[PDB]
Amino acid sequence: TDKSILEYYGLDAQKYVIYLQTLAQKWNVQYRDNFLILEWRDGNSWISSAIVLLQAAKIRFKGFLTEAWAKLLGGDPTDFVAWCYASCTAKVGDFSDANWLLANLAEHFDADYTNAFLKKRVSCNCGIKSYELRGLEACIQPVRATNLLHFKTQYSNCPTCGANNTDEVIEASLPYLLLFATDGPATVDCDEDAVGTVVFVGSTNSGHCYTQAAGQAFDNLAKDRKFGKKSPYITAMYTRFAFKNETS
């Protein structure tokens, strides 16, 4: 079929079927404080987590998702959530990955990808390499644990000289910073500067997630989940992240 449909929705054919399927869904919602929360059902929470996250980070969308996100916040998550499932080739009922979903959605954030940058420096026995990341790549950042301590200095091995190397963030200017865990949940303190986080509990093959923001936990299933500064985080998000360095 047509591709000014497949390209206006940002989905290939297979995913567009799933999208159409999921448009039949009705997602009940309620407010808790200033956050719109989807009622839990059918392995919902990876959808819910991302939605609370986006609200905490005051995110807006461009394209089709602009009005889909507006409709959700006005009380009708159908169009937005449908795209969410479709983007991850998932059917309602499926358990899945909030960071996968967030990376899909981030492509369509109404955000300053034009001017976003990270300046970095890697040191090894080869010498010292300075380099720069820009746009969306600069904003979405894999880390071992989701706080700035694990972001600003990362370590690996250099395949050329064989030495342990050190990759550090020297300067940053980003509309948002999205940290996501590379090896499943890792328990650390969150930064006070993080406007929101996602906590994952249980098996990574059969778990449950929820979002923390404004000193509260927003688990769309467990309504009495307790906020915890130190939690098994898979995600942390910062708004207008800016930093310029020093190291001596």
Binding site: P142, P159, T204, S206
Partner: protein, 76 residues
């Protein structure tokens, strides 16, 4: 051609690939060196999630690119 992968724990490994290689091919190559099941793998290039049916070419992935291997989560 050669690309780099940052593994679950941030190790740097090297893969030999071609632009025509599918994401599944790459996951299989990763499993060879790292012992991680394909269905436990999420591969990222420059912030973008890489999908099983597609090729390195489809994503404009060139030599000496770095991909990020991430543990896939399944929660509900």
């Amino acid at each position: 051609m050669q690309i780099f992968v940052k593994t679950l724990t941030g190790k740097t490994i090297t893969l030999e690939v071609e632009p025509s290689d599918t994401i599944e091919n790459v996951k299989a190559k990763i499993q060879d060196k790292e012992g991680i099941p394909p269905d436990q793998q999420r591969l990222i290039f420059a912030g973008k999630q890489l999908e099983d049916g597609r090729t390195l070419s489809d994503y404009n992935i060139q030599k000496e690119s770095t991909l990020h291997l991430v543990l896939r989560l399944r929660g509900g």
